[PDB]
Design a protein around this ligand. Structure first.
Ligand SMILES: Cc1ncc(COP(=O)(O)O)c(/C=N/C(CCC(=O)O)C(=O)O)c1O
Ligand SMILES: Cc1ncc(COP(=O)(O)O)c(/C=N/C(CCC(=O)O)C(=O)O)c1O
Lengths: 396, 396
């Protein structure tokens, strides 16, 4: 049965972990996978998370199954983060949330739900985007088409090209938007651009699907949700796939949410029952530990204050690394303008390196980035910055 | 987009939790969902698990992503449980294991892997089986056909009907076997019947898929894997979807494994790369907490001894409830032979109640079972046994 199976191609991102660690030389520097590092080059457990875990250890009395949609408090807290306390969507009970294994899990549940219960056949994704978007949607039987996004000359959002691209999208197509911290470009729509896009998607009959993996890493929790909320104010229906992997540092505990919004309570409840059916036939019900940590923190004033400051600390350290990166590149070498790196949002910079320059960085210098030229600024430290920048200057 | 979606039908099992708890009367008795209860009617966290969780709390330094296939130690420990220490499958490196979110997750990963990478179109499942089998395989685009299994007159395995049923299976079809503790009948093949089936599946060209959710609940860890190992000794290829939900009491942490076996190391590695691709496009990588607990326990002599005794305690309490059930039914009423309940394996008894008798039990008496007549013996206690048996006798 298996003797004729062809090997899968290497994953453009996760496969870097394989190449790394297999690399035996001491000075190697990992700027690949999007995981936060502190100033010592480690990815620690958040202190708020350790405190929540101690509370769960001391107070959990059962591991009995959650409902298919997970912990109710987790869903309520998620909807408040997305839409705002006092939101009309929440008051009118227009939103239902399923706790999922990660943001990836939420994207797949959305895709399965859409493929089986609607007329959706196509998802529009930005060029460039996260490489696993195409994989998730294709796996559900949906085709993926690309829209223009990035002006590489000016390092801006090519808004006119984006709009003209999406003219080929038909009513009933899904359009995927990154909520904030675009992966890989770090360039987000302005509020006015979000507002224009919200209006256009209504008029064109697109179903918005938000991928919201970095809330809090651009400007702040409320600020980063402005685009989503502009869409929520205009649309009867949308889907949000959100992740707590980065902003709680809970990567391996698989903590995400799929939030379904419809015109009214009766409709969203009926539609959500089919989302739950899609979950039941996938992994049955979701993993409690990570989501319980998130719910415990978000619903407690003390823990939430600790966590919000830890998230602020992460955001500010990345911003400090952006500036140090630009300054150190000017030292040690070029003689080219990298000021655009300072304005980018999130953990990545899309640095202008070619595929071959990235290969050379890996092979010659032990500096690891993604072939797209994406580098993880959150992986930079005061200690590794000089060798990193010396390496980049060497490859031009 | 959503205004025309039809509501999903109620889940035959998990939907009981909804009907329960919504039921406001004090004397209600839950014999539905397959979760262990102790003598006090609670589903506690195992002590071995609490100890492992304290160790993780004290020693975990990161939540950085696991590999797509999860914790390496978890996979090694899983393969030893399935195949035995010193197994040829392990020595020849013919098996690869992915840590998954639950046994359900492992079944779905198997199904997706098979649908996309092989010529499999059909899965054969026993009549009766777990209702979610059909849902999982259909969701991957595989059709499900049923084979005969149960002689209800003699409460035995109808082996001749099983064999004649499977004559309609073609080479290249998948045949699903429950490893031990058949859900819902509690009737397993004898070792000699397993050995016959292993030989027959080789000659017929079936791909065996084992669902192994209850290892340790029939006779013991090694004993319960005899059937699987008989198949392993005869087949070049098979798949095992196993769960630690029940035998570690880790239901809501979603701890399972999908184990792929091929003729040699080169083949299983090539095939497993496509299993990892199927996972990446689903939930990306698996939840660490539950699987880390399992790995921590299985790989430590002290913790594993505590856990093995806790599992023995659970198995023996269920056996004591089987006897108390049969004895108490004879008291309080019938006048019918229930001795077959004593010989059944696992947490369920398939009691001979009709759909309407089960409805009456729920509506009139607040006793909750599945419409198939399946009752959770592990939900019976010395304290709830008399009202339970009085209710059953009342409906005949
Ligand atoms: C836009 C976007 N959507 C979803 C995800 C996945 O989040 P989780 O499934 O919660 O780990 C991510 C995580 N991205 C990573 C982390 C590793 C990965 O999954 O690729 C990266 O680009 O390096 C993301 O950037
Ligand atoms: C033969 C068989 N295969 C897989 C599973 C699912 O195990 P997990 O996904 O690890 O929770 C189960 C769990 N069965 C339950 C528990 C609740 C459920 O998932 O249906 C039941 O029949 O009541 C099972 O019996």
């Amino acid at each position: 049965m298996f003797e004729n199976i062809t090997a899968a191609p290497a994953d453009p991102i996760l496969g870097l972990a394989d190449l790394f660690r297999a690399d035996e030389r001491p000075g190697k520097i990992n700027l690949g996978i999007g995981v936060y590092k502190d100033e010592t080059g480690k990815t620690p457990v958040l202190t708020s998370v350790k405190k929540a875990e101690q509370y769960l250890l001391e107070n959990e009395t059962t591991k009995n199954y959650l409902g298919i949609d997970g912990i109710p408090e987790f869903g309520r807290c998620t909807q408040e983060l997305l839409f705002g306390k006092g939101s009309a969507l929440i008051n009118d009970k227009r939103a239902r949330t399923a706790q999922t294994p990660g943001g990836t899990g939420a994207l797949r549940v959305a895709a399965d739900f859409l493929a089986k219960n609607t007329s959706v056949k196509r998802v529009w994704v930005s060029n460039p985007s996260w490489p696993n978007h195409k994989s998730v949607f294709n796996s559900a039987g949906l085709e993926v088409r690309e829209y223009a996004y990035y002006d590489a000359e000016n390092h801006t959002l090519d808004f006119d090209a984006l709009i003209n691209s999406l003219n080929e999208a038909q009513a009933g197509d899904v359009v995927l938007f990154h909520g904030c911290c675009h992966n890989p470009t770090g360039i987000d729509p302005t509020l006015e651009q979000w507002q224009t896009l919200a209006q256009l998607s209504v008029e064109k009959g697109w179903l918005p699907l938000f991928d919201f993996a970095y809330q809090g890493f651009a400007r702040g929790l409320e600020e980063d949700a402005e685009g989503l909320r502009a869409f929520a104010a205009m649309h009867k229906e949308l889907i949000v796939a959100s992740s707590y992997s980065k902003n709680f540092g809970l990567y391996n505990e698989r903590v995400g949410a799929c939030t379904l919004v419809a015109a009214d309570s009766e409709t969203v409840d009926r539609a959500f029952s089919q989302m739950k059916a899609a979950i039941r036939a996938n992994y049955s019900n979701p993993p409690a530990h990570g989501a319980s940590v998130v719910a415990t923190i978000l619903s407690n004033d003390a823990l939430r204050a600790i966590w919000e400051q830890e998230l602020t600390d992460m955001r500010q350290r990345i911003q400090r690394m952006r500036q140090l990166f630009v300054n150190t590149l000017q030292e040690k070498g070029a003689n080219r303008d990298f000021s655009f790196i300072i304005k980018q949002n999130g953990m990545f910079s899309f640095s202008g390196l070619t595929k071959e320059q990235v290969l050379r960085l890996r092979e010659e210098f032990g500096v690891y980035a993604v072939a797209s030229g994406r580098v993880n600024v959150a992986g930079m430290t005061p200690d590794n910055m000089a060798p990193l920048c010396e390496a980049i200057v060497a490859v031009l």
